[PDB]
Symmetry: D2
Subunit: 245 residues, 4 copies
């Protein structure tokens, strides 16, 4: 109980899906949570958390724009005090085969997934290194080591891993940990359109024999955010039931 009592956390992309489950678990452990998203459903997400007794706020933000990320952090800190935990979960897909991928679809995915994560990491780092404490948890993807149709997405999520590791080397001596999680196949409100035949193939690749839930990702986030995980830094942890993509 209360591993993260009165810590302030920003979770990007947390209106739905994996990010909302992360937010739920952080709130369960006592964190005050900022849901940062472009999706207006973020307000309903924050309200759901509040209804359960947690303190939460939605801040509408496009993380690809530095000025908006700056404003996000300033507003978060005005509301809830210093940001102790940043979870970079925001990510989009615009899949296409390598020979067909448009420049626009390339650009959009790199801008959100990779640049947006950099911009948020940067705002956290500026603050956390001065304060001498912090947690940065990046949500990458099982696709970081390749997946058909995901030239842009795999580039973006592998790039997040590289930044995770660099950031660990720069920030560990300041009392900050920076780690990445790679979810496996997670069944959420954002995967309700996966065809049955495709689910069967996915499940066949999972030793556990079932698709995970958003809260499985959230439990790992909450551990990494805790004081107990002070000596885990620069790691890439799969939360996937053994699945190899």
């Amino acid at each position: 109980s209360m591993a993260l009592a009165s810590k302030t956390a920003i979770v990007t992309g947390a209106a739905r899906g994996i990010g909302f489950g992360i937010a739920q678990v952080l709130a369960r452990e006592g964190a005050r949570v900022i849901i940062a998203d472009r999706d207006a459903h973020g307000e309903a997400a924050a309200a759901s958390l509040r209804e359960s007794g947690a303190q939460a706020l939605f801040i509408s933000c496009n993380i690809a724009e530095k000025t908006q990320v700056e404003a996000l952090f300033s507003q978060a800190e005005e509301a809830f005090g210093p940001v102790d935990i940043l979870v970079n979960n925001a990510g989009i897909n615009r899949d296409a085969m390598l020979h067909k991928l448009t420049e626009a679809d390339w650009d959009t995915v790199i801008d959100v997934n990779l640049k947006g994560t950099f911009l948020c990491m940067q705002q956290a780092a500026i603050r956390m290194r001065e304060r001498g404490a912090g947690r940065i948890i990046n949500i990458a993807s099982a696709s970081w080591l390749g997946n058909v149709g995901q030239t842009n997405y795999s580039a973006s999520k592998a790039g997040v891993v590289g930044m995770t590791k660099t950031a660990c080397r720069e920030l560990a001596k300041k009392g900050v940990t920076v780690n990445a999680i790679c979810p496996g196949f997670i069944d959420t409100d954002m995967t309700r359109g996966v065809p049955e035949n495709v689910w069967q193939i996915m499940i066949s690749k999972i030793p556990a024999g079932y698709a995970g839930e958003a809260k499985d990702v959230g439990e790992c986030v909450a551990f990494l955010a805790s004081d107990g995980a002070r000596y885990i830094n620069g790691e890439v942890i799969n939360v996937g039931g053994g699945m190899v993509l």
Copy 2:
């Protein structure tokens, strides 16, 4: 509080060092703990846990002998009920350069570190797969990807990683998780004789800038042992403050 309430754990090699810190954290979270070791100080270790309010017992065992591992599990279960958590921490070093390593020093390290871990995993697996639940956590080493003077030790700990991954593939569908932890440079009661100059070199390789404590390893074990970590399987998690060996 009490993430492992009602659970029973065997920790091998837990009389001192990293293993004892693992046992302390599991006990803190409510597990009943069997300290399995050849070291007679194991009794004092179990007594220390009892003095702190935990349920703990020492069982003298040489994990390289199958009959002793069988007896360990039968006695553990007679005392404390079904073993929910196995932590394979026992390991020894008999270091030598590749061109100098004696056959006896080879044989001893493989027998304890690799065969002993297999024998304990096997006794856990037989039980856990029938019961439909379990946790196996193997303590490997940063040396699994090579270290001067450690042909035998690196062989043994890399071999533990291979078995971890195999066991995940076999046991995940039965409700068991199998994961490995690689400690970095951890300062314990078993490293009090490391020379100052050698510590300085070690610390220079750690981004965090300090050597970890046995309880840092224990926190990660306790998370992996928890119900919250049900979807983490087959992983190798470094607990080393960013250190690359």
Copy 3:
């Protein structure tokens, strides 16, 4: 001798350094080589190859612009016929600590190193998948798993690894291999420009005890480009004398 006889290769970033050594080895093995670079010294590079008896041409190109990459490939094929081998070596650095990295310096490094590599891979893939044969060799970096001061560079080079792996999955069945090489510490004008203390530290991290040459990278490229390496696909091979960064 002549493992790549009358194959056509484009090597990006080949005016100097690692890329020029790659070009030298490909030419030694009989490839006709396009040196593609922004650096005008590319002409002298091509002339050096020609003086040795090889067929080589310099094409001035900024690989961050899709139109220039399209023109590069069309010109290459008009001169030397179908492109059998693409080596993506072009890359820039604009290093800075995470808390100090300007948006322009982020943007520029991603645009050249990551987007530019994608655009070249895409032009190769369009052609090679129709022809039923090809080689794509991406030069990543030891920094892809982190390096102080290299948030942007490490992002870009880890992203190249993700794309390498994706491309293998899409193109292997078409007779194309896609692989990456991570040079270690290679003796070039750029590494000779680091401070003396940094040079000594780097040599102390290399088991071989010396900094490699550009031609060492070239030998690995030439093997992967050969018919003998038809079954090596999606790999990331370090050419670094054992160095772990």
Copy 4:
């Protein structure tokens, strides 16, 4: 042509299968080859190489016994001069699920695959470090990161990777490289003996869409053995057409 002219190689486990394909390619490149095996078909293997124009000799050896490995190296050097290249390919399987694996089947696989490889590496290292040159190439397996039914085999082959990396760290400064290859799914008499459903499943896991040949592994061995690969050390290279097990 003739990348390994004047060199002498020992290939263990080279009577059949992957090891014989390795021997063929080394002989094609001009090496004198010792086939070291327990299998009496080793004589026919060496005769086939001789019939093709190569220098080759069969030496019967059980690599699990140190005295036999010592005799192997002494006899090899009496016949063909200093051993420049050691390829550790010998390995056996005694597969069984973790909960069923007998002690004898554990013991035998570790003794051959892991101890035997150590003993051979040790005899090579003693010699090569004094001479200031050498190549050690260990054949591991795709199973080193887990495979159902292969607790013992996966332990043994992961252990080989650990030793490879250790040996690189000790021997690189003496002019020796130590590397490992992990074959994928290679078409041999042994893989053709799997059940139909397993064959189909395996082909579906290979991006290249076909099972490789023993000579594909041999091509990678021959490159690593060459002077051109002097700066590749401590690597684990998959020869698998992109296959992830």
